[PDB]
Design a protein around this ligand. Structure first.
Ligand SMILES: C[As](C)(=O)[O-]
Ligand SMILES: [Cl-]
Ligand SMILES: [Sr+2]
Ligand SMILES: [Sr+2]
Length: 135
């Protein structure tokens, strides 16, 4: 029809006297009729990303990301649903991404990894940690 100029932030005019919140935002009434009404972000993460991932809420949207220690086989850094999830554990030992001391051997774990000592751990540092150092 027409277009109200006074639509509040994150809403768009539906005609000359009304607005509606943009996708990802919500207001008490389905149709806004005054500029005093607000369009608040909807936290989609509080309403499934799938295995080994995390939901991060953003303004107007949200993103699923592989959790730390996992990376997407498909390569897509962000995704929207379980169906697009390609998160697999990162084998830090095979990839040489680990930061183990030359005195230990990298041992892969799901979501992480550790370093094991023949040798014995130096004083004050346990065995089987990322910072393990032996002698
Ligand atoms: C950290 As999760 C796999 O429950 O989105
Ligand atoms: Cl949203
Ligand atoms: Sr949101
Ligand atoms: Sr790992």
């Amino acid at each position: 029809r027409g277009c109200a100029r006074w639509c509040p932030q994150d809403s768009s005019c539906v005609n000359a006297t009304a607005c509606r919140c943009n996708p990802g935002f919500s207001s008490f009434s389905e149709i806004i009729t005054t500029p005093m009404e607000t369009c608040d972000d909807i936290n989609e993460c509080a309403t499934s990303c799938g295995k080994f991932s995390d939901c991060w809420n953003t303004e107007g949207s949200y993103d699923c990301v592989c959790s730390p220690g996992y990376e997407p086989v498909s390569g897509a850094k962000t995704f929207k649903n379980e169906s697009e999830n390609t998160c697999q554990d990162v084998d830090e030992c095979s990839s040489g991404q680990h930061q183990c001391d030359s005195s230990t051997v990298c041992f892969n774990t799901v979501g992480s990894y550790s370093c094991r000592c023949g040798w014995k751990p130096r004083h004050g540092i346990p065995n089987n940690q990322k910072d393990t150092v032996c002698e």
